[PDB]
Every structure is written in structure tokens, then in C-alpha cells.
Amino acid sequence: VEKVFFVTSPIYYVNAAPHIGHVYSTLITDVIGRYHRVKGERVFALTGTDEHGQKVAEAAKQKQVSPYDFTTAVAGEFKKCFEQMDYSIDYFIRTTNEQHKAVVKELWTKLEQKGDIYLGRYEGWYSISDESFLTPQNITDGVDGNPCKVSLESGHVVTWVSEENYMFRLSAFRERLLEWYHANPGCIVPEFRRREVIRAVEKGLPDLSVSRARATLHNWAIPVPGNPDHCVYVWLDALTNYLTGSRLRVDESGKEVSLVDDFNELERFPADVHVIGKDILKFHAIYWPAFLLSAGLPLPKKIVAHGWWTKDRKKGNVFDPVEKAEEFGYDALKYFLLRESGFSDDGDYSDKNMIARLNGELADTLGNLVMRCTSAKINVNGEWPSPAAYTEEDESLIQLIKDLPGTADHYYLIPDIQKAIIAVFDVLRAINAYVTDMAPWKLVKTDPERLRTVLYITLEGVRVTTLLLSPILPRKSVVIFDMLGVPEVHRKGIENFEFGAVPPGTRLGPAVEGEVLFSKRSTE
């Protein structure tokens, strides 16, 4: 059924400035979003900041500033960061928003009315930096430089907690979560993280503390309805951002104008894809579903958990994203982060490797190809020629180009953006090979009729590969299409995934004396 494609990033704690990693998480959200928009679908990509809680309040206290002023200042830093990265996110949500607060209270009330929240105690370990309850099996010894306990997850300092808290009956949802994981084998990606979650829930689930004593949080939280002494767990608050996002009417400015009663009215909920980091799996794959199940809400379709940490600066080389983007280009940096990093994440992010892939792939494979097929030397009429008869070699390359969109489509749907990039560049490599074999520079004179067929296939290969690379290189793809002189209408739509969609006779865009699409960086 047609609904709005809803893709989300996590909302980041605002205890410290934005850094790489927030950027990576949001980039993944932005690319998935962008790709569905080139497919012609309706999209709503969501991002933002997690502003309540003990972690954030104690960061604000440690800088001698009011939480109100602090959450706002850092929230601003994130927005500026994401503006300057040239994303295309539809809305930036803050948990301090008053409509957000309303949704949390509605969601809470439903959980309670369902008979799934009881007054209890939590006596156990807690990681303030992760806002995470941990069992004794998940802690160990470590340093402050004093002897203390630390979380096995993150290595952050853990503390004992003994509070009367409101408890959520998570243990009641073990069997339904297990049905869900199995009946929908694609709900968690990558597959090995799906197996991790299933093992965790198979071992058993305790109930979860969903409130905290107000003293503990420095009164920087959403109050529990019907009990001002308590505050809603920062994570239940935080996870509710997705439901709140799905219910906000937003204007062209990006300001929210209205909170609708029923999520169905905007056709966004539930999320089609939640992009998260490996460090926040349990909240999304265990807790969030259980809350949704309790309240009677539809579950998300997919949670993709990438190989990075969502939130530790220390981690993995020192790497400012805006500084790099000015050093290497924004599109190029995004390409590199997406190409280099898989799910297990064994990535080499050195300037050596960054230069290798820029020079090698972007310049020599893609850049090269675009200049060859638009050169006054080769393309003397500066147009899309009409092709003659196709040789078997021609047809071998045409087939690859024809098959590319189906293959790239599947990868983006996984989603595995790395694999989709590899698939497109595999075709780009083939096109270069074809072009070397055919030596069109010689054909201009030898055989003009042959050059037409070869030039046409090259142009159409370059077009289609660029369409599929457009969620990754949004600014450069526009330049490419301008050089090829592709009409705007043909720059999106599944219709334009088809080989031959730009007709012969189309005129190439005008050249400039100085322009180069990707400039090779100093050899070091």
C-alpha cells in the first residue's frame, strides 16, 4: 500500500558538539531518503537531538550553564552542522519540543491503561553515559584514575542505583518479539545483528525501569502523568521522537505547525527504516517494539544497524567532517565514508586511502569517463548521437547497464549502500574497458558511423550510473547531468532507469575553460 516512505536517524544526545559519526548516521538516513525520492516516492526523513536526561543535565552543569540554554546552544550546533553537510532531511526534531512532550504523555498513558506499567524498584547497575540499565554479567573493572566498575558495552563508568521506579512489563513481550524476529527475517539488518538480538531475547527479558526519581535527573526530563515525583526514562522519551515525528505537520521553512491526533493522517508511521549505530541496538530492536506492541501501534519494518558507534568521540582517526569536506569536497567525503565502511567496519580512513579512492574511483573511473564522452575531440557535434548496429561486445556492456538499476535497487533496499556503490562502479569500470577497446579517439576519423554507436552507449552508461550514484553524489550528479545535457524530467523516476530514456539529438551542456569534475589531490 502507498504510504510515505519514512526513514529516521537516531536523535543524538546534546552533551557535546556534533562530530563525525552523528554525521555518518545522518548521512545514511539522508542517502536512503534521497534514493527513494529519485524513485519518485513520497519521503519523510527525520533527524534531531536527545535533550532530556541525567547525562545531558550533568554535562550542562559541568559547563556551568542552564540546561535550557545549553540544550538550545548545542541543538543549534547540530542544525548548523547538518545544514553545512548538505543533507535533505525533512524535519529536525528536539525532545524539548512541547508537542513531543505531549506524544510521550499519550504513549505513556496507553502503556498504563493496557496494564503494562507497575510501581516497582530497580536495584542494579546503570551507565549514565549510555543511559542504560546493565546486568552484572555486563560490567567489569576499570579506571575512573581510580578503581571502579565499567560497562562491557561501552567501557563507561557504571553506578549502582536503588530507586522505586515505574516498571514496564517487558518480560511479557519475549515470545511476541521472538515471533516478530522470525516472521520478519529482514526486520534487523545486518543479519548477524539479527541473530544477536534473537539470542539476547531467547536468554530471557527482565522488566524495564521506565521512570526515575526526579532528584536523580536534576529535574531535566518529562514528568510521568499522574506522578510529578517521577520522570519518564530518557530512552522511552527519546524513542518516542519517531512517533512524534510521524505526527507533525511541517511547513516549507522546516518549522512544525501542528501535531495531528492520529498518525494515519500523515501516512508516515511506522518507520520503514530506522538507521542506528551498533551501540543502540537493544533500545530499537527490543524495547521499542515491546512499547509499540503494548500500545497497539504498528512495528517498524526495518532497523539497520551500521558498524559505527553512535556517540563516543574517543572511539578511528581524528577527523573533522567540515574540515575534510573543504579539504576534499562534500560529495567526495560522503562517497568515501559510504564506500569505505561496511557493517563489520574494518575501515581504513587515512588520508592515503582517502586520496586513493578520490583519485582512483571518482577521478580516473567516473570523472575520466564523463570528460571522454563529452570532449569536443571525441564528441564533435556535442550531442547524443544516434546508434548504428550493435556488436556482441556492445551488447555485453548494454546488458550490464540494463541490469544495473535492478541490482542497485536491491542493495539500497537492504539497505547496503556500500554494496550499491560497488555495483555501480563495477559497471563504470566495464564502460572504461569498453572505451579503451574501442578507442573512439581513433574512430572519429577511421569510422564515424562506428563512433556513433560507441559514443551513444558510453553516454547512456554514464547517465544511468550517475542516476544511481545521485543519492551519494548529489551536487556532482547535477553537474554530470548538466554536462550530458540531460533534461530535468529525466533526472528522477524509475522510468529513467531504463536504457535509452534520453533520446539521440539531445544537446550536451556548454563547457567551461576551467572546469574539472574531480581534481586529483597531491600524490602522497
Could you list the residues that contact ligand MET (CB under 6 A)?
10-13, 50, 238-239, 241, 280, 310-311
12, 49 Cβ separation under 8 angstroms = yes
Nearer of residues 85 and 238 to ligand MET, judged by Cβ:
238
The smaller minimum CB distance to ligand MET, of residues 117 and 238, is found at 238
> Least separation, in Å, of the C-beta of 269 and ligand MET?
15
Provide CB contacts within 8 A for 33, sequence distance 6+: 5, 7, 43, 45, 88, 89, 90
| Residue 122, SS3 per DSSP | strand
Q: Are 466 and 480 in contact (CB under 8 A)?
A: yes
Q: How far is the CB of 14 from ligand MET (least distance, A)?
A: 9
**E-strand stretches of 128-268:** 132-134, 139-143, 147-151, 158-168, 188-189, 208-209, 211-213, 223-224, 227-232, 248-250, 256-259
Minimum CB separation of residue 231 from ligand MET in Å reads 16
Please say which residue, 125 or 242, places its beta carbon nearer to ligand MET. Answer: 242
Task: Please report how close the Cβ of residue 9 comes to ligand MET at its closest, in angstroms.
Answer: 8
β pairing state of 43-50 and 91-94: parallel
CB of 6 to ligand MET, least distance (A): 14
One DSSP character per residue, 371-388 reads: HHHH-TTT-TT-B-PPP-
DSSP 198-227: HHHHHH----EE-EEETTTTTT-SPEETTE
Helix, strand, coil % in the chain, rounded to nearest 5:
50, 15, 35
Q: Which is nearer to ligand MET, 235 or 481 (CB)?
A: 235
In this chain, which residue has its C-beta nearest to ligand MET? 50
Coil, strand, or helix at residue 143?
Answer: strand
Whether residue 242 contacts residue 8, with contact meaning beta carbons closer than 8 Å, is answered with yes
CB proximity list for 366: less than 8 A, separation 6 or greater: 425, 428, 465, 466, 469, 517, 518
Least CB distance to ligand MET at residue 50 (A)? 3
Q: Which residues pair with 123 in a beta bridge?
A: 162
Taking the least distance from each CB to ligand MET, the nearer of 248 and 455 is 248
Minimal distance in Å, beta carbon 376 to ligand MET?
52
Strands 147-151 and 139-143: antiparallel
Q: How far is the CB of 401 from ligand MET (least distance, A)?
A: 40
Nearer to ligand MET, 48 or 367 (CB): 48
Please, what is the minimum distance in Å from the beta carbon of residue 212 to ligand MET?
A: 15
Dihedral (Cα; 278, 281, 283, 285), 10-degree rounding: 150
State how far Cα 331 lies from the chain centre: 15
10 or 474: CB nearest ligand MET? 10
The CB-of-239 to ligand MET minimum distance in angstroms stands at 5
Residue 33 or 367 having the CB closest to ligand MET: 33
Nearer to ligand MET, 71 or 458 (CB): 71
**CB closer to ligand MET out of 11 and 370:** 11
The least CB distance from residue 86 to ligand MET, in Å, is 22
Q: What is the widest separation between alpha-carbon atoms in the chain? A: 87
**Helix pair 67-84, 321-328: axis angle to 10 deg:** 20
> Measured from the CB of residue 308, what is the shortest distance to ligand MET in angstroms?
11
Give the integer Cα–Cα distance in Å for 56 and 50. 9
Identity at 306, one-letter amino acid code: H
In angstroms, the CA 76 to CA 423 distance is: 38
Which lies closer to ligand MET via its Cβ, residue 239 or residue 451?
239
CA distance 90 to 43: 8
The vertex-461 CA angle with 353 and 468, nearest 5°, equals 60
Closer to ligand MET by Cβ: residue 201 or 275: 275
